[PDB]
Amino acid sequence: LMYPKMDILLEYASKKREKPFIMCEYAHAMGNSVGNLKDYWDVIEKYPYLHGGCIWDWVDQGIRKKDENGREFWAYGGDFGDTPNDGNFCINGVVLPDRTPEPELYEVKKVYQNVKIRQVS
Amino acid sequence: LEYRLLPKPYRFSFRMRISEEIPSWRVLAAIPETLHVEMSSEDVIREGDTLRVKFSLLNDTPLSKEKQVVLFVDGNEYSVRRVVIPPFKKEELVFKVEGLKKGEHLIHTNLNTRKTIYVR
Ligand SMILES: [Mg+2]
């Protein structure tokens, strides 16, 4: 499934299932985003038949262009007199076009890490 | 009735000093004053069922705490418990929520603990 809410995951884990549950796209990273990423994985690690998924997506499809003054900016839909266009809906990354990390990539690293540490005392 | 110590938990503290002069009663030694808290439940349940919300409260500090744990559902005050945690002690609570209809529901406290709960 694509961008399922939590209730869906928990519903799928609530009865015996022959097939494992995978999220081919989840946590849409458009602009300043990727909220409640730990809340997904708390569930995936707890309940049966949930085996992860893939974040949408890696890189922002922003073309390099120069303005009137000659200062560089990232271009998106409607910045080439192209009509009809769907604006900045092609800017969905965790990294900028040049692969410069957006803060949200630091959260992905934390939540994906493979060591878990608990405080006994 | 309103002048009788009925048998419930009770805490009580005071400062003592042995010195040649009388120190200012308004001044005291600083100490940490916060509790550690964890909330936990079934992230989901079936319409009609009962939601069980568990709360662990650790007191690492050198004084007795006396706290009023309030449970909110969808912003409205649903229930409250009175606790007395002695120093170097954890206390566990269970609340029972009843009557949640289909759809997502906000469970939060007055101790900075929050959680979305789905109702199939
Ligand atoms: Mg972004």
Side-chain angles (χ1 to χ4, degrees):
Chain A
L1 290 180
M2 272 168 51
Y3 308 106
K5 303 311 206 294
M6 218 64 70
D7 55 320
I8 302 300
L9 269 71
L10 291 163
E11 165 68 79
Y12 192 87
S14 80
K15 302 172 195 166
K16 198 188 179 296
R17 305 290 180 179
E18 309 290 347
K19 299 186 180 176
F21 187 108
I22 301 290
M23 296 182 292
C24 51
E25 315 171 358
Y26 82 113
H28 202 251
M30 185 178 186
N32 204 354
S33 183
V34 193
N36 60 66
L37 187 65
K38 192 184 170 279
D39 300 347
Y40 271 109
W41 279 83
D42 288 331
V43 167
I44 289 156
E45 287 167 320
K46 187 164 186 285
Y47 292 90
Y49 310 127
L50 307 180
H51 279 279
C54 294
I55 295 162
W56 186 271
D57 75 336
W58 180 239
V59 65
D60 285 322
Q61 301 184 77
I63 299 169
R64 189 183 257 112
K65 208 187 176 287
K66 263 165 160 54
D67 67 343
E68 308 311 322
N69 311 286
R71 51 172 179 269
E72 280 197 3
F73 69 103
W74 307 113
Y76 54 77
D79 305 355
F80 304 92
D82 55 298
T83 299
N85 68 66
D86 280 306
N88 82 294
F89 192 72
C90 51
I91 308 303
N92 304 162
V94 293
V95 309
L96 290 165
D98 61 11
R99 302 288 184 269
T100 302
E102 300 215 314
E104 59 215 34
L105 188 58
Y106 304 121
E107 198 78 346
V108 169
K109 179 178 187 177
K110 186 58 154 66
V111 172
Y112 272 7
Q113 79 183 1
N114 304 293
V115 187
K116 276 172 198 313
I117 309 167
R118 186 172 66 76
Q119 187 167 67
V120 183
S121 70
Chain B
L1 283 173
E2 77 244 37
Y3 311 109
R4 282 157 80 176
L5 298 171
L6 306 176
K8 65 179 188 188
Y10 288 100
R11 59 153 208 87
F12 169 55
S13 61
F14 64 89
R15 181 261 304 252
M16 179 162 62
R17 186 187 291 189
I18 295 161
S19 77
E20 296 172 352
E21 47 88 66
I22 286 162
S24 187
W25 65 281
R26 285 196 269 116
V27 186
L28 282 171
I31 53 168
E33 289 202 330
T34 60
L35 295 172
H36 183 251
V37 298
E38 298 279 347
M39 193 168 73
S40 72
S41 68
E42 307 80 322
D43 327 43
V44 36
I45 63 158
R46 294 188 150 287
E47 197 168 36
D49 288 351
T50 299
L51 183 72
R52 281 167 162 283
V53 188
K54 307 191 189 294
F55 285 97
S56 58
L57 300 103
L58 179 53
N59 177 348
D60 57 353
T61 84
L63 294 184
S64 301
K65 300 298 170 68
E66 174 175 340
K67 207 77 195 165
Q68 316 301 351
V69 186
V70 181
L71 185 59
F72 300 82
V73 181
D74 315 306
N76 295 332
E77 298 90 338
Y78 178 89
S79 197
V80 57
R81 209 76 63 80
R82 177 185 180 264
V83 304
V84 171
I85 319 180
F88 321 111
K89 194 136 174 144
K90 181 159 274 184
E91 293 305 324
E92 300 203 333
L93 300 176
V94 183
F95 295 93
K96 292 174 78 79
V97 188
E98 314 287 20
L100 296 168
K101 299 297 93 203
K102 291 188 289 188
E104 63 166 11
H105 293 278
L106 175 60
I107 315 303
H108 82 276
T109 302
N110 61 1
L111 307 177
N112 208 48
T113 49
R114 288 171 147 271
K115 189 179 201 295
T116 295
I117 254 63
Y118 304 84
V119 177
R120 276 151 84 251

